Amino acid sequence: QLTPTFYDNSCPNVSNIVRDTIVNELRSDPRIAASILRLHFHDCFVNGCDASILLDNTTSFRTEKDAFGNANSARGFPVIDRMKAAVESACPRTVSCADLLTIAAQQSVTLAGGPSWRVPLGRRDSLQAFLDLANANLPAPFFTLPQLKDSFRNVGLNRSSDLVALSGGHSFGKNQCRFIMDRLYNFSNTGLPDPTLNTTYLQTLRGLCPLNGNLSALVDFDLRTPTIFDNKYYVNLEEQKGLIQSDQELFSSPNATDTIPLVRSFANSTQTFFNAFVEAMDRMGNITPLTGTQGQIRLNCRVVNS
Ligand code: HEM
Ligand SMILES: COc1cc(/C=C/C(=O)O)ccc1O
Ligand SMILES: COc1cc(/C=C/C(=O)O)ccc1O
Ligand SMILES: [Ca+2]
Numbered sequence: 543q544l545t546p547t548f549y550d551n552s553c554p555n556v557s558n559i560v561r562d563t564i565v566n567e568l569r570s571d572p573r574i575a576a577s578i579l580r581l582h583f584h585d586c587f588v589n590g591c592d593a594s595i596l597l598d599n600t601t602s603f604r605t606e607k608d609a610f611g612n613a614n615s616a617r618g619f620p621v622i623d624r625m626k627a628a629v630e631s632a633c634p635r636t637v638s639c640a641d642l643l644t645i646a647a648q649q650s651v652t653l654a655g656g657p658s659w660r661v662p663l664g665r666r667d668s669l670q671a672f673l674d675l676a677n678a679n680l681p682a683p684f685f686t687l688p689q690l691k692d693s694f695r696n697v698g699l700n701r702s703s704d705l706v707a708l709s710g711g712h713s714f715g716k717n718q719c720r721f722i723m724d725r726l727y728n729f730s731n732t733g734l735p736d737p738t739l740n741t742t743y744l745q746t747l748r749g750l751c752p753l754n755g756n757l758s759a760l761v762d763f764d765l766r767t768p769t770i771f772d773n774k775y776y777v778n779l780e781e782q783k784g785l786i787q788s789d790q791e792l793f794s795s796p797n798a799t800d801t802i803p804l805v806r807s808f809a810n811s812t813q814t815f816f817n818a819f820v821e822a823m824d825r826m827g828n829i830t831p832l833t834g835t836q837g838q839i840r841l842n843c844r845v846v847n848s
């Protein structure tokens with residue numbers, strides 16, 4: 543069983559080292575906190591939270607970094623190496639990359655103004671990466687609500703509260719024009735913009751993402767508080783101002799009978815959202831972990847030991 547006190551004896555300062563590393567990085571890159579949370583998410587949705595996503599290419603297996611969901615998207619890997627090196631110096635061969643990334647995600651959320659809690663620990667590192675599993679498991683921004691739900695259930699999260707609460711991760715962070723071009727100019731081959739996108743916001747987004755423009759240009763997930771982790775992400779949905787398709791569907795989809803009340807619940811109370819996010823976060827963090835003697839304590843998160 544995973545436990546929050548796993549390193550209280552072997553490395554009582556792991557959480558502190560991780561925090562300081564993020565605090566320093568945030569001064570030169572205010573997007574790092576969001577990037578790190580996403581890395582933990584993409585790690586857990588592929589064979590569980592086993593740091594498989596941090597592994598680089600080998601002649602035997604391809605890195606998950608080249609998955610459609612990570613390629614020219616996932617970021618912050620060097621920052622993870624920095625906190626890892628620091629932790630290894632403070633406590634040699636003690637903290638796994640999988641646990642490190644979990645703590646890093648929790649600290650990122652807290653540093654961004656989100657809830658604060660102690661994540662369960664005791665996960666160990668994988669001996670391989672799963673590129674194909676990543677392309678199949680990572681949900682896409684153009685997914686319908688049914689697909690989004692299927693995606694979460696596929697990894698072990700059956701609750702709609704998991705999807706709605708974890709989707710709150712979009713209360714900060716950036717998104718490329720590339721993933722909303724369809725919503726702005728030609729949604730589902732209708733030749734028209736997505737009707738579930740507020741017309742006034744549509745205009746704003748079209749200005750940031752003109753047709754035939756830079757598809758790599760970055761746009762904020764939350765027009766209200768772009769870098770602050772809060773429940774404003776849900777208020778946007780209620781106003782049809784969710785950035786990507788997968789966001790707005792939680793409130794506009796014909797299959798959203800169960801997600802709508804959850805969206806409103808989180809939008810009405812920060813405490814309600816924070817509690818659900820913590821609960822959902824720990825559930826995601828409990829997806830098929832390697833524990834005990836399974837897997838290893840990777841010294842360099844990029845490669846398997848020795
Ligand atoms: C429900 C399905 C989800 C889909 C379809 C989805 C899709 C995406 C997309 C398209 C981006 C933009 C990537 C880019 O432009 O390169 C992104 C970024 C992000 N996502 Fe999600 N996401 C989902 C769930 C989540 C979850 C569960 C979390 C974490 C709890 C999360 C946290 C983030 C963060 C923080 C960013 C911004 C990262 C950065 O700015 O570096 N996402 N996601
Ligand atoms: C970067 O932040 C920290 C680093 C350490 C390192 C200890 C060691 O190397 O023994 C301890 C506490 C910290 O908050
Ligand atoms: C950029 O982020 C994502 C992209 C995809 C898929 C892209 C594609 O199939 O072209 C899936 C999940 C993601 O989180
Ligand atoms: Ca993984």
Ligand SMILES: [Ca+2]
Binds near residue numbers: 764766771772774
């Ligand atoms: Ca916000």
